[PDB]
Amino acid sequence: PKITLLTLIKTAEHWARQDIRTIEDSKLRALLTLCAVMTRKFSKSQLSLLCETHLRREGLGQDQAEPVLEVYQRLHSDKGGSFEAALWQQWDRQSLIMFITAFLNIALQLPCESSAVVVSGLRTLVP
């Protein structure tokens, strides 16, 4: 199947509603890519809001904002999956699972652009 924008979102919808703690590593690795690709569909301005929401929902302290925002920033600017590969190599499986699930559940509810002019205009078009 073609990885269109719609397919990408439907794939995210689907995996957001799964318990991924027992899935094989090959699929977990692919989910990391999904999070990376999906992160890049947010404007740069929305990454702090992504971080703040991640912290709030996961019950993390403000001292965790630096590393969490860094993950989102470095995925957003990732070239050739270099940073993505580093996360896979250097984090334990439990950390990856928790970050991935957290992201997939927040990503579909946050706006992907921040300009009021963009948001207000697009709302007039929604059925």
């Binding site: 996961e58 940073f83 190599q89 950390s95 970050f99």
Partner: peptide, 11 residues
Amino acid sequence: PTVAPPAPVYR
């Protein structure tokens, strides 16, 4: 390749 940041600590 690079050096990843630390994973989030739950507490």
